Paper text:
Thioredoxins (TRX) are small globular proteins of about 100–110 residues, which are conserved in all living organisms. They participate in multiple critical redox-reactions via the reversible oxidation of the active site CXXC catalytic motif1. Two TRX forms were described in [name], Trx1 and Trx22. The former, called EcTRX throughout this work, is a widely used experimental model for investigating the molecular basis of protein stability, folding and function.
However, in the [name] mutant, an interesting case of structural variability was observed. In this mutant, an extended, non-sequentially continuous region of the protein backbone presents two alternative traces for only one of two monomers found in the asymmetric unit. The widespread alternative-conformation region involves residues: (i) Asp10 to Val25 (including helix 1 and a half of strand β2) (ii) Thr77 to Val91 (comprising strands β4 and β5); and (iii) Ser95 to Leu107 (involving the complete CTH). Occupancies of these conformations equals 50%, and no clashes or packing defects result when alternatively occupied segments are assigned to different single-conformation models. The RMSD between these alternative conformations is 0.65 Å for the backbone atoms and it occurs without significant changes in the radius of gyration or total accessible surface area (data not shown). Structural differences between these alternative traces are explained mostly through rigid-body displacements of structural elements, as a result of changes in dihedral angles for the first and last residues of each segment. A well-preserved hydrogen bonding pattern is found in the CTH of [name] mutant, even though a Gly residue is highly destabilizing for the α-helical structure. Consistent with our previous report regarding an increase in enzyme activity when assayed using DiFTC-insulin12, the rate constant of [name] reacting with DiFTC-insulin was twice that of wild type EcTRX. Given that a negatively charged residue (Glu) is replaced by a neutral amino acid (Gly), we suspect that this difference in charge may alter the electrostatics of protein-protein interactions modifying in a subtle form the interaction with EcTPx, one of the natural targets of EcTRX, or with the non-natural substrate DiFICT-insulin, and concomitantly the EcTRX activity. The alternative conformation observed for the backbone of the [name] variant conform, to our knowledge, the widest region with alternative traces for the backbone reported to date.
Author numbering: 1 to 108
Amino acid sequence: SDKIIHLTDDSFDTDVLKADGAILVDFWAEWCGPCKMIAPILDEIADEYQGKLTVAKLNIDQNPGTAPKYGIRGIPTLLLFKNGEVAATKVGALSKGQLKGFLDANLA
Ligand SMILES: [Cu+2]
Ligand SMILES: [Cu+2]
């Protein structure tokens, strides 16, 4: 959890929309089973992609305002932003290999 940015509804604009470069945002909640499975994978990816990608999390129970702005209707949802704009998204459980495939297809 040492390389994961903690987001809130209040900080989302500064931390995500005003960040330079690429940021992967995980929308999650404690009641979401697949969210728990992907959490350690996100730590691995935050290290492996350090320098090319920042990884962030937003808990939708505690910060319920942001997900509706992206039409998010299921979790986990991963949003990949580049320079403040969504480039690609993924909904649902995925393996480490699927996550790396998603990132490699969207990051140089
Ligand atoms: Cu960590
Ligand atoms: Cu918090």
